Enzyme design. Structure first.
Site, PDB file in Angstrom:
ATOM      1  N   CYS B  62       0.808  -1.220   0.000  1.00  0.00           N
ATOM      2  CA  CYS B  62       0.000   0.000   0.000  1.00  0.00           C
ATOM      3  C   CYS B  62       0.847   1.278   0.000  1.00  0.00           C
ATOM      4  O   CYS B  62       1.859   1.381   0.731  1.00  0.00           O
ATOM      5  CB  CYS B  62      -1.004   0.006   1.205  1.00  0.00           C
ATOM      6  SG  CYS B  62      -2.088   1.406   1.077  1.00  0.00           S
ATOM      7  N   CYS B 101      -9.095   2.534 -11.258  1.00  0.00           N
ATOM      8  CA  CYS B 101      -8.988   2.250 -12.695  1.00  0.00           C
ATOM      9  C   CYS B 101      -8.883   0.765 -12.996  1.00  0.00           C
ATOM     10  O   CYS B 101      -9.066   0.371 -14.116  1.00  0.00           O
ATOM     11  CB  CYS B 101      -7.757   2.928 -13.328  1.00  0.00           C
ATOM     12  SG  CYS B 101      -7.699   4.726 -13.224  1.00  0.00           S
ATOM     13  N   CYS B 148      31.726  -5.544 -43.909  1.00  0.00           N
ATOM     14  CA  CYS B 148      30.704  -6.266 -43.167  1.00  0.00           C
ATOM     15  C   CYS B 148      31.281  -7.090 -42.009  1.00  0.00           C
ATOM     16  O   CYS B 148      30.586  -7.364 -41.079  1.00  0.00           O
ATOM     17  CB  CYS B 148      29.825  -7.128 -44.083  1.00  0.00           C
ATOM     18  SG  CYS B 148      30.704  -8.418 -44.990  1.00  0.00           S
ATOM     19  N   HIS B 262      36.416  -5.931 -19.233  1.00  0.00           N
ATOM     20  CA  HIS B 262      36.881  -6.938 -18.313  1.00  0.00           C
ATOM     21  C   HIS B 262      35.903  -7.192 -17.182  1.00  0.00           C
ATOM     22  O   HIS B 262      36.040  -8.189 -16.492  1.00  0.00           O
ATOM     23  CB  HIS B 262      38.291  -6.602 -17.779  1.00  0.00           C
ATOM     24  CG  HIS B 262      39.375  -6.762 -18.816  1.00  0.00           C
ATOM     25  ND1 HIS B 262      40.087  -5.711 -19.304  1.00  0.00           N
ATOM     26  CD2 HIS B 262      39.856  -7.889 -19.449  1.00  0.00           C
ATOM     27  CE1 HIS B 262      40.971  -6.164 -20.217  1.00  0.00           C
ATOM     28  NE2 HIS B 262      40.817  -7.484 -20.331  1.00  0.00           N
ATOM     29  N   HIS B 393      30.486 -13.050 -46.838  1.00  0.00           N
ATOM     30  CA  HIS B 393      29.670 -11.919 -46.407  1.00  0.00           C
ATOM     31  C   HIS B 393      29.117 -12.223 -44.999  1.00  0.00           C
ATOM     32  O   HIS B 393      28.647 -13.328 -44.745  1.00  0.00           O
ATOM     33  CB  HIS B 393      28.519 -11.679 -47.423  1.00  0.00           C
ATOM     34  CG  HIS B 393      27.608 -10.549 -47.048  1.00  0.00           C
ATOM     35  ND1 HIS B 393      28.076  -9.315 -46.763  1.00  0.00           N
ATOM     36  CD2 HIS B 393      26.214 -10.492 -46.885  1.00  0.00           C
ATOM     37  CE1 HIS B 393      27.044  -8.481 -46.432  1.00  0.00           C
ATOM     38  NE2 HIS B 393      25.896  -9.194 -46.511  1.00  0.00           N
TER      39      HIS B 393
HETATM   40 ZN   LIG Z   1      -6.889   5.535 -11.433  1.00  0.00          ZN
HETATM   41 ZN   LIG Z   2      40.153  -3.736 -19.092  1.00  0.00          ZN
HETATM   42 ZN   LIG Z   3      -3.335   1.041   3.055  1.00  0.00          ZN
END
Ligand SMILES: [Zn+2]
Ligand SMILES: [Zn+2]
Ligand SMILES: [Zn+2]
Ligand SMILES: [Zn+2]
Ligand SMILES: [Zn+2]
Ligand SMILES: [Zn+2]
Ligand SMILES: [Zn+2]
Ligand SMILES: [Zn+2]
Lengths: 92, 437, 91, 92
Positions: B62, B101, B148, B262, B393
């Site tokens: 809470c 909500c 590449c 490292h 490639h």
């Molecule tokens: Zn709310």
């Molecule tokens: Zn290092």
């Molecule tokens: Zn409470």
């Protein structure tokens, strides 16, 4: 009464065994791909219902995610939980 | 069509003392969750105050009192109704739920970035959220030509969580003694990050051109693995140059380095000799590694290649023995080279094109010297080679958050399913630590 | 399978499982002193296994792909900044 | 009605599983709520089952028809030649 469950959990935590079970289950679910499947399912369900509302999304995901747990994981972890409970409960 | 904000927390936030109270409490709850050992965390943040069950679904802490309440028996919801406290923090993830909500509050930057609450006006005015297009750092690197072998590696670095945190933390920038991206490799890498994630005929090639310019100044081969080694060595060298007391730190620790390379990529191997009689480990040698090179000949699976790397080879009275190679220390990011290029004695080159199956999650427990617990890594990067040792490639594949994979083929970035990624002929694999039991 | 009679009395005693099942008086806010004493903990990277199998100075990010990279972009120079680097940069 | 080692074991597993699902789903829904609030015109990255189009739905550009301006010598250089060009140009 029916605070059996909560007292058994307290024992499992305090003895170190709940951690073991919890980590073992998580390691299995992760490695079999269930964690990522649940994340996919969740995204898919947000798209489907056009919503990010947690309560609504959970009600569609949770039932399906429970069923997606493999038989192997489910019955292995259940056996491991039973075995710890066999040590601490009397039956009749 | 517009997504809205929880109206309740917005009302609360009309009062600045209330806003600050909420942010203090959220920070406090999150701190506790990151600084409680597993038993305390179960008994004190995951135990429902009404039913006393552990993990009865999510347990919420809470905002307004010390109560914790479960989801599955709706006990926090009852607390919000009974007592009027409608906000709670999920103790698995630190996220803030509005029980009016019936949703999480996930779209307020202040609450997400609560550790900066005290600086929030300055942060808000002086920085902006990432742009939609740059938010995942996705961009291609032109082949400029036979480059590449460099760009495939750079895509894996730029998508590596440890390097990206390092670069965005400004650590190199704050300490660099050269401060020029046409001389300093590390400054060139920061520029690429800047270009891909922020804002600085073609686009977003500047940092890469800088890096080529740095490379040349050292001096200009073919192999993506060699460029990986080159570039991590440069990152290390730059750290050592920026220290006030390089001599002294080495003397004190020597052979411990605190650089990003490292502290992330380095592990060590233990080469041992063991008496078959009694299993007395007579003699071990520890040697560091930055990646593991694996033989793939006549194998089908990554775990077979590791099993071969780890295999045993060749009281009264310990020396008349067996030799074994195992892992002494694991790295945070494990990098694997599958050796595919042969260079024969007659000057000819051959490419091993064998498919080797590699897993999305890798368990390294069977390879650590010593019962070893589960030590599980997540696959996040692959470099693949196609063609001949010299006329070939490289392409990179990187996994980002949410689990989408992307293919980087020079300037072309495309989405690719996991199923197709797992069929690639892997040359380098990048694994990041995910779970240690 | 077999029906439960109860938890073994000895286990009830050893572990002090008898708990008056009225509402708890605990407060999560009371955890703060202990939390300040305690080094950073991970949800599922066991501290003792980390000491054994990883380097003592390892960098560690738990669940690094959990969410996208958390950063903001400097409006002056357009640099991407980690949340913990923003205040220092703004100078 | 009847409480057994097996039913309690299953209750324990169901606690572990629903918790973990509820965690994953909360992480997904908050993230998506953020992305959609931050970018009201958010588009998915393009996926092409045929493997031809990129994340913006576009074909591969022909990299040899592009050029880059070299800041060392002030010329335009065809993009696929820049690394060879630099060898010759930075040596100057
Ligand atoms: Zn709310
Ligand atoms: Zn290092
Ligand atoms: Zn409470
Ligand atoms: Zn409850
Ligand atoms: Zn530099
Ligand atoms: Zn012996
Ligand atoms: Zn700036
Ligand atoms: Zn030039």
């Amino acid at each position: 009464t029916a605070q059996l469950k909560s007292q058994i959990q307290q024992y499992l935590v305090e003895s170190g065994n709940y951690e073991l079970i919890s980590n073992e289950l998580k390691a299995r679910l992760l490695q079999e791909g269930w964690v990522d499947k649940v994340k996919d399912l969740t995204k898919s369900e947000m798209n489907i219902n056009e919503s990010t509302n947690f309560t609504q999304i959970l009600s569609t995901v949770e039932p399906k995610a429970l069923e997606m747990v493999s038989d192997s994981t489910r019955e292995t972890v259940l056996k491991q939980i039973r075995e710890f409970l066999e040590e601490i409960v009397d039956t009749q | 069509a517009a997504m809205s904000i929880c109206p309740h927390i917005q009302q609360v936030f009309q009062n600045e003392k209330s806003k600050d109270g909420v942010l203090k409490t959220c920070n406090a709850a999150r701190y506790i969750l990151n600084h409680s050992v597993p038993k305390e965390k179960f008994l004190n943040t995951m135990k429902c105050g009404t039913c006393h069950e552990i993990n009865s679904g999510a347990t919420f802490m809470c905002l307004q009192c010390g109560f914790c309440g479960c989801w599955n028996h709706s006990h926090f919801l009852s607390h919000s109704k009974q007592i009027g406290h409608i906000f709670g923090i999920n103790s698995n993830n630190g996220l803030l739920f509005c029980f009016k909500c019936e949703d999480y509050i996930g779209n307020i930057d202040l609450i997400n970035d609560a550790i900066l609450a005290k600086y929030w006006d300055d942060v808000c005015t002086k920085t902006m959220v990432p742009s939609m297009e740059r938010r995942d750092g996705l961009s291609g690197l032109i082949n400029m030509g036979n480059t590449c072998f460099m760009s495939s590696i750079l895509q894996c670095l730029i998508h590596n969580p440890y390097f990206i945190r390092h670069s965005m933390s400004q650590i190199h920038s704050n300490n660099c003694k050269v401060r020029s991206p046409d001389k300093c490799f590390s400054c060139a890498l920061d520029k690429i990050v800047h270009e891909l994630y922020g804002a600085l005929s073609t686009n977003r090639q500047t940092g890469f051109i800088y890096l080529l310019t740095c490379a040349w100044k050292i001096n200009q081969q073919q192999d993506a693995h060699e460029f990986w080694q080159f570039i991590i060595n440069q990152i290390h060298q730059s750290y050592v140059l920026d220290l006030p007391n390089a001599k002294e730190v080495s003397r004190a620790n020597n052979k411990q380095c605190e650089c990003i390379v490292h502290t992330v990529f380095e592990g060590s191997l233990e080469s041992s000799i063991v008496c078959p009689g009694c299993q007395n480990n007579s003699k071990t040698t520890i040697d560091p590694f930055l990646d593991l090179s694996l033989d793939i000949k006549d194998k089908k699976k990554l775990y077979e290649c590791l099993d071969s790397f780890h295999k045993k080879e060749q009281c009264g009275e310990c020396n008349s023995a067996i030799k074994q190679l195992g892992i002494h220390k694991l790295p945070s990011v494990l990098v694997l080279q599958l050796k595919r290029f042969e260079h024969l004695l007659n000057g000819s080159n051959r490419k091993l094109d064998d498919f080797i199956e590699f897993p999305t999650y890798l368990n390294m427990k069977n390879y650590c010297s010593t019962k070893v617990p589960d030590i599980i890594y997540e696959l996040i990067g692959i470099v693949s080679h196609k063609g001949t040792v010299n006329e070939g490639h490289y392409i990179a594949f990187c996994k980002i958050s949410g689990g989408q994979w992307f293919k980087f083929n020079d300037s072309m970035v495309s989405s690719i399913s996991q199923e197709e990624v797992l069929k690639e002929q892997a040359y380098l694999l990048f694994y990041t630590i995910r779970q240690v039991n | 399978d077999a029906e439960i009679k109860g938890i073994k009395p000895k286990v009830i005693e050893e572990y002090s499982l008898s708990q008056g099942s009225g509402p708890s008086n605990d407060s999560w806010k009371s955890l703060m002193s202990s939390a300040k004493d305690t080094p950073l903990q991970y949800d599922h990277m066991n501290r003792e296994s980390l000491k054994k199998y990883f380097n003592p100075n390892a960098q560690l990010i738990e669940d690094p792909l959990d969410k996208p990279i958390q950063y903001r972009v400097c409006e002056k120079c357009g640099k991407p900044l980690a949340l913990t680097a923003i205040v220092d940069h703004l100078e | 009605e009847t409480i057994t080692i097996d039913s309690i074991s299953n209750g324990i597993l169901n606690n572990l599983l629903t918790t973990l699902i509820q965690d994953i789903v909360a992480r997904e829904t908050t993230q998506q709520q953020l992305l959609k609030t931050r970018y009201p015109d958010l588009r998915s990255y393009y996926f092409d089952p045929n493997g031809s189009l990129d994340i913006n739905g576009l074909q591969k550009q022909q990299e040899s028809s592009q050029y880059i301006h070299c800041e060392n010598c002030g010329r335009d250089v065809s993009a696929n030649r820049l690394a060879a060009h630099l060898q010759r140009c930075l040596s100057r």
